[PDB]
Amino acid sequence: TTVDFTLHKIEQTSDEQIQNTGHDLGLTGRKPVQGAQFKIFNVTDAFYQLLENHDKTTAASMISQNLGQYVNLQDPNAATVTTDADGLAAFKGLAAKTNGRHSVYAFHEAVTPQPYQKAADMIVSLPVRQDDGSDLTNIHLYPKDSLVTKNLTEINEQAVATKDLHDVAVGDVLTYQVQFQIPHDIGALADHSQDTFKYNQFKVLDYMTKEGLTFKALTAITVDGQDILKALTGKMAFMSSNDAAWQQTHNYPFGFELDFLGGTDPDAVRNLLTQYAGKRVTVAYTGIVNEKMIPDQKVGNTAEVSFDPDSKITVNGPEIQTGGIRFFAHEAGSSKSLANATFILQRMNGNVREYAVLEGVAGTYQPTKITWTTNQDAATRLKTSGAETANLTIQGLLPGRYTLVETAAPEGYEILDPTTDFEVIAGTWGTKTIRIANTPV
């Protein structure tokens, strides 16, 4: 006589010990995960052999921690079903008894879809008996895939609503957070080994291919509501785009590589991680938007979590972008470029005028920060070049409505209109280059 196992693969974004009854839980209202490949193994003999020296709990635990020690994982006979769009994968018609004992079955996620981490290898020992004193013939399991994620969480230390695209100003500090799971078997030894651990690399690589950000700081590493970073530092390996090391191995203009087990004392780290095994880690860091952040340029990041050199779990973060504007100061009635025309940048703030002060500083302004004052004389005086198509450029601005105010015409000219109202368009230089005419004398 036989038994069926129907699996319900589901997404996990937090810590959650919830027990498998084996009973059908119906509409649980949880996101299913598709494309998880599961293999099943009869471990009844191996289990009962352990059961001579160890209790029931310890036996099942030993098999979970090193399933490939007790079975040939790449067995062609081993029944394999892949999880569908509802997260469903049924293994049917399995022997209820094996060599005179109630059967023990082990389940192993062999291929885990991106960007998930695999479920722990689960062990079921029959029977699973109903409260009416009768065995279940269909056993329902809810294995969990932990979702690797990356978000932009704060801008200038204020929480922002999460979205795929953010508008930034030059000199903004951006807080990012990468989340992932400490493996359930982090502290286990390699299958058939007394002298080598199973895990020898727990790496987080995060970078941007395009320019725009300068690495500021790694702010925290937390798990289980505890700050782990103070304990780790020294014992693990760390590189940032600010370190001369970085340009040796990578050529991304921004990023960091962290390895919990690449440091001076791996084993001490593995110990600490084992204490929080199966739980969710948040690695937080900050970056500063720099003068090389340009308009018409969306720039994102990729984070890669890897446990060996040959594999990785990859996730993309949101893209950021910035505004700019171009002007052309010229002689009324022609296209003669007028250099040395003097302007200040204005905006309204609840029916009050503020004027721009640029920290970084031709006609091309590319500041490192823009602050705002109601003292008009403190405003940065902007000068035009003699360039052809546009002779005043500004970038790193938020989108919205501004006013360019001309405070001195070039020698030999007089101002037509002192004020030019305009609009910075999100992530672009704008509709067109704005022409400003000055009349000669």
Residue numbers in the entry: 37 to 397, 401 to 480
Quote the study's own text:
The L. rhamnosus GG genome also carries the genes for another pilus operon called spaFED9. The tertiary organization of GG-SpaD is a tandem assembly of three Ig-like domains, wherein a middle domain (M-domain) joins together the N- and C-terminal regions (N- and C-domains) of the pilin subunit.
In the C-domain structure, the observation of continuous electron density between Lys365 and Asn477 confirms that a cis isopeptide bond is present and located in the first (A) and last (G) β-strands of the CnaB fold.
